[PDB]
Amino acid sequence: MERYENLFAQLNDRREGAFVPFVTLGDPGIEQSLKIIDTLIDAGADALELGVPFSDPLADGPTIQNANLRAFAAGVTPAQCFEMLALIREKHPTIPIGLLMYANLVFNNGIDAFYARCEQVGVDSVLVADVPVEESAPFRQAALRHNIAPIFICPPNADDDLLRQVASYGRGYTYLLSHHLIEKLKEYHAAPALQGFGISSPEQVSAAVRAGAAGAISGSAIVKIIEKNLASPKQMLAELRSFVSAMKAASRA
Amino acid sequence: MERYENLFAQLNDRREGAFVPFVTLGDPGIEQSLKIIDTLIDAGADALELGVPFSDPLADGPTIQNANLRAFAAGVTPAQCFEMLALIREKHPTIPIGLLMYANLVFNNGIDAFYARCEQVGVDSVLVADVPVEESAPFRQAALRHNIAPIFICPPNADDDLLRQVASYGRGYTYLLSHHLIEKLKEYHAAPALQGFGISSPEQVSAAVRAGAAGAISGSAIVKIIEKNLASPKQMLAELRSFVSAMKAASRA
Amino acid sequence: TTLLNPYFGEFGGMYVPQILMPALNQLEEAFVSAQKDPEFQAQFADLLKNYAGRPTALTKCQNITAGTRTTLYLKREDLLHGGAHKTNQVLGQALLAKRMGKSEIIAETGAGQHGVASALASALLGLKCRIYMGAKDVERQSPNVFRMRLMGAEVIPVHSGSATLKDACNEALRDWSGSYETAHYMLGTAAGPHPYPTIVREFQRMIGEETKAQILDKEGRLPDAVIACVGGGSNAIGMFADFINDTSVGLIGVEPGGHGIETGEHGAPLKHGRVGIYFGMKAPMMQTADGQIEESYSISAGLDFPSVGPQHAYLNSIGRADYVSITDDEALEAFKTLCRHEGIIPALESSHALAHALKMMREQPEKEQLLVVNLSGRGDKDIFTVHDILKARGE
Amino acid sequence: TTLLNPYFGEFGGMYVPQILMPALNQLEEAFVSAQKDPEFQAQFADLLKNYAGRPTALTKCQNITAGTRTTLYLKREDLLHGGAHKTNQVLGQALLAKRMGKSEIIAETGAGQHGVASALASALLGLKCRIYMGAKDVERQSPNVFRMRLMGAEVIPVHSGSATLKDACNEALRDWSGSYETAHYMLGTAAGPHPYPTIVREFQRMIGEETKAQILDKEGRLPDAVIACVGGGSNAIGMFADFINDTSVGLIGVEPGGHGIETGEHGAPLKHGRVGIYFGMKAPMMQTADGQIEESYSISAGLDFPSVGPQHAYLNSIGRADYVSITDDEALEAFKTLCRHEGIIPALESSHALAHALKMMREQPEKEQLLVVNLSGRGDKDIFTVHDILKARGE
Numbered sequence A, B: 001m002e003r004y005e006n007l008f009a010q011l012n013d014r015r016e017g018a019f020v021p022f023v024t025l026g027d028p029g030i031e032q033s034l035k036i037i038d039t040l041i042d043a044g045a046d047a048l049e050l051g052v053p054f055s056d057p058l059a060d061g062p063t064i065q066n067a068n069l070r071a072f073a074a075g076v077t078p079a080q081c082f083e084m085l086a087l088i089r090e091k092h093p094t095i096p097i098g099l100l101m102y103a104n105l106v107f108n109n110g111i112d113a114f115y116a117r118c119e120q121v122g123v124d125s126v127l128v129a130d131v132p133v134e135e136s137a138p139f140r141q142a143a144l145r146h147n148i149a150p151i152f153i154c155p156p157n158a159d160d161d162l163l164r165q166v167a168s169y170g171r172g173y174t175y176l177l178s179h180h181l182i183e184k185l186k187e188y189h190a191a192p193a194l195q196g197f198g199i200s201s202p203e204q205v206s207a208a209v210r211a212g213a214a215g216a217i218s219g220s221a222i223v224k225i226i227e228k229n230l231a232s233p234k235q236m237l238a239e240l241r242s243f244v245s246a247m248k249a250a251s252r253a
Numbered sequence C, D: 001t002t003l004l005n006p007y008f009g010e011f012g013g014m015y016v017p018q019i020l021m022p023a024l025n026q027l028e029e030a031f032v033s034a035q036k037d038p039e040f041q042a043q044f045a046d047l048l049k050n051y052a053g054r055p056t057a058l059t060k061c062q063n064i065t066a067g068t069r070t071t072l073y074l075k076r077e078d079l080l081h082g083g084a085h086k087t088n089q090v091l092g093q094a095l096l097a098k099r100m101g102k103s104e105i106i107a108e109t110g111a112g113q114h115g116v117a118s119a120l121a122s123a124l125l126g127l128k129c130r131i132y133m134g135a136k137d138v139e140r141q142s143p144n145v146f147r148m149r150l151m152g153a154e155v156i157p158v159h160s161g162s163a164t165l166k167d168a169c170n171e172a173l174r175d176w177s178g179s180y181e182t183a184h185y186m187l188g189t190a191a192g193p194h195p196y197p198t199i200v201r202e203f204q205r206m207i208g209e210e211t212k213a214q215i216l217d218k219e220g221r222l223p224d225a226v227i228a229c230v231g232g233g234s235n236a237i238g239m240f241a242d243f244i245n246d247t248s249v250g251l252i253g254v255e256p257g258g259h260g261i262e263t264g265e266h267g268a269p270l271k272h273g274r275v276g277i278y279f280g281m282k283a284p285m286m287q288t289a290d291g292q293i294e295e296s297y298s299i300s301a302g303l304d305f306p307s308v309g310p311q312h313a314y315l316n317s318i319g320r321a322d323y324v325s326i327t328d329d330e331a332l333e334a335f336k337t338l339c340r341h342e343g344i345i346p347a348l349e350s351s352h353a354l355a356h357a358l359k360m361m362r363e364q365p366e367k368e369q370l371l372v373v374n375l376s377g378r379g380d381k382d383i384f385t386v387h388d389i390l391k392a393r394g395e
Ligand SMILES: *Cc1c(COP(=O)(O)O)cnc(C)c1O
Pocket: C083, C084, C085, C086, C113, C114, C188, C189, C190, C229, C230, C231, C232, C233, C234, C235, C236, C302, C303, C347, C349, C350, C376, C377, C378
């Protein structure tokens, strides 16, 4: 499929950036997670980034660590996550769905089989948080064989060699953690950049797009709303809807 | 004075051995100790050996360790012991009184002053338990300057050099811990031997004398009767009287 | 790009977020430079000798081997400053931190031995040390925590995940990814991402070098086998490295069998786990069927690492080294044996290596064999644990 | 008659019951013979090196002395097997026992360090070891008692007198007077009757010999002063002996001042007691006015001997060595200082010596002086004691 390509072309036509919320699948439980995700979509999320609970999330801060703990507390397994992904794709045929994975869960039952399962349920991209570009070859190859975009992080400490590698090897979008970077990525024909550092308010969404990025990823702020409203699922959904609506509005021309 | 010399001459005339009980001064208390000692004398003790309570009685077994603890528990001091000794001598002018001392209490206020105090209260001999003959010179000299007999132990492991030294340096009596020894001591004109090992019954008293010793010292058995009858001072005295009477009878020709 | 191969065969690698690659490349660069620098080497040798007390003794154990054809020597890492071999490599890593212009140390610790080792090295070299430790571990390791604080280290209790070593491992990396311009991450074993398995081996290799010299002097030949316990793999690779090319010398690593392999309660991933990717490396792991990392189990908290260094995985795959396990009760017997027959109280970690040497001897008492056990640490720390078990068994 | 002079000036002697003189003469004879026997010396050197780990390091402490004209080195007896210098002399005495054909060891212990030292030496050399310990001490020294029993020693609680060290001292002698044909009494310090102050000095003198060689190599001259803590006097006389004839080298012994000399709660008889005769020797004692022996007091149980070795009394009287005291709080500060600034946890005993060196430096920071402190042991054992005080003060 070409879900990212189609999304970016449509957004471009509307002079619009992407807004992409992250949540952990199964947080705080399977049924509630499903309603969360549909709420994000109905509020105007342009794509999703979705985490699978893992014992040791090396690249993640406190909010996400806590999301993981909640999802495990609920007994959420990778198999159940893939069941969820199939359901989500069945409800929503065009929205790009990206996973944020840890290497062990990809490698566990064979790397090729993992990406085969991704393709079967209708995932579009996979970011493997603990695989640097230098080690990515078998992950990228398996991804592309199964029509999955491999996503790479372009960190603040990126050099020119890294930019070229990220530009050449990534598809779907480039995950930016930051303006020089944005210009260089475009020069090297990289996948459109989404800014993923510190996107917690509408002004940062607008700032990302104004700087030349194709959009912005809210890496933790959505999870913060979950964590805050655990005792009140109805209010949780309410607050997610208004937050996502506001963030997406900020992306609009 | 010549109390030992006189005692041995008198005993010899009667073909009789000496019986000499040991007690700790002040055990179990001052007044009771005084009655104990008068009881031993009236029952037929020929001489006394008397211990002064000391913090660390290096040469003493469990029965005596416990006697020391009792006397300290009662608050008994060396000064009080010397008060007791003066009283005892005033009651009984001929019986030889020997002390069993530790070196520190002799040395504490000056060795010469110690033996001067011994002479003043009417003590006849001093055995310093932790001074071997090899180190005895200042103790022997102070003793003799104050008309006090220095007493030495002749141990089971004694050699000929030790026998000669003990024979030459001791006065009053030789304290035997054991028949070769007895013969050698006499050959070297030693002070009359009193057997001090294991004298806990009449048969051992008789055996000592039959072996050629001048008599026997009951090093702990008297203290055992004290320890056994602590709760009953009247019975204590009763049992001491019958024991000492029996032991002295055993010495008689 | 790296200067050195990050893999041992298929095992090892640099499986860290992209943000941490410059920190690893920097460290590799600094290490490669250090290893060529006589001044660095002279400084390291000075610390090992005059501060830590190298060389360590090689003790013959005639009382233990009487009536057999085994000759047994213990390499006495238990006599090193700090009471375990960990001290060797923390002094090297501290000097590397100084070489890179860093003034702060970050460390992870489980049982606390690495925390203390890191803190003492930091105190000596005037580095500001902060140590991550699982809250559960903090609770159960009061003596070690107090030693760390006495030595001026900040001890940071980790409340995330299970709140154990693997979680401390994670939180140290989080800090480092933000602080690596000024802070060095002092990893505690021969594992994690390249270049750490390489650095840690090279900063422990004097164990084996001294052992070889000492056994040549005392016996006129190489040992038939050298035997070491395997947590993450540092003491073992330190003993093994100088012997790898002496192909007549057996290399035997001992993983904790815990309550017994068949119970699943052990710490023996190399032989009874499954390759995975975690802690920055591709290596055998204790893990569930669906790929979640598990805690190991051993009587000995110091062998409770749920993976193993990649060079051990490699050496096993090519058949150069053999790996075995020893259970809690076997290690306890070896502990008792050494106290009673040699008057040395060994670490329960090291007692696993000794237990396997005792098995080699007892199983085949007329086999002529010259064995060295790496006695990785002393076992004062373990006397409460041993006391508690013996009482509970009625001993 | 003896082969050697039993006195140091007026101090020392053999003040024991007559029954024990043959045992002392036998021991003196065996020692004089041993000291002339290259085989005995080679065996002892073998144990010290290959078992205990001699030579011990000499560590420079630049962090502590920065900004002053003091250069400070620690002689690292804390790195010896068993974690204190006691190990040196127990190995020598165990070999002497073997030379005399004895198969059993009797020992006294207070804090337990000598009990453990005796037990480990006995285990190594296959001697049957029984250790007398005051019931009060048994109660308060659970870790040491357990180590002794692990090493196969019988531990005998003494209930007589106060039931402390002096009483254990007594009960060991009682046993020996009956058992000396088969048992050797392994006395724990450079005190008691001749020949023990002499033997213990000579079996500790490698401390000072190595220090002299090491300081010549590192600094090209002798130290201005060597500084050691004084319980019974063994570590100190061990450091001092080889320097006695180098009259430019100050010899400074540090007694425990406890809560302060003026409080009477201390362990400093050499400077604040009174000569007496006890424990087989004429020497300064803690004693009442009427001559009963008192208990000393120190934060450090190992400096709680209520007398002092006679050679120290002698060296003081002739002005060859100077003796000072250091209080509990001074020793605690020195303990903290060494942990934080050098990453070495010292024994609270040794912390008294360090405290006085720190005073020498701080009082006169522009005085040029090269000082060695004998770091007699490590202080893992003391961390609960230190923790408890710091908490009680609110630290
Ligand atoms: C830390 C430790 C170990 C285990 O770690 P390795 O890296 O496998 O050496 C073993 N023994 C001791 C004494 C330790 O302190």
